[PDB]
Amino acid sequence: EYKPRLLHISGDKNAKVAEVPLATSSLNSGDCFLLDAGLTIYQFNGSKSSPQEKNKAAEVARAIDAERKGLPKVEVFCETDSDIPAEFWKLLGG
């Protein structure tokens, strides 16, 4: 059971990213987010944010891209409206 993991990419103007506990409700729409689930991963990026988390997140997905070589499945998208596909929200929130 893979341990889902909640990586967060954001910080208004002080962009800061870091590991985080599960958080569907405490998520932060607008900034870029990354949940890791065994082999699959959803960089739930938030379109309400910008190049801060976006860059930081692209950097995080990057390091993970070089670590796993894309072996695992990833889904990145800095989306906002309807930014809640039951799949990811369910995986970590449902």
Domains (range + CATH), the chain? 1-94 (3.40.20.10)
Query: Is 83 annotated as contributing to ligand binding?
Result: no
CA distance 35 to 91: 9
Query: Is 30 annotated as contributing to ligand binding?
Result: no
Strand pairing partners for 8? 18, 33
Helices (H), the chain: 51-68, 86-88
CA distance 49 to 36: 21
Strand pairing partners for 75? 42
Query: Is 36 annotated as contributing to ligand binding?
Result: no
CB 43 within 8 Å of CB 75: yes
Query: Is 9 annotated as contributing to ligand binding?
Result: yes
Query: Is 13 annotated as contributing to ligand binding?
Result: yes
CA distance 14 to 19: 16
| Strand order, beta sheet including 5-10 | 16-20, 5-10, 32-37, 40-45, 73-78
Query: Is 25 annotated as contributing to ligand binding?
Result: no
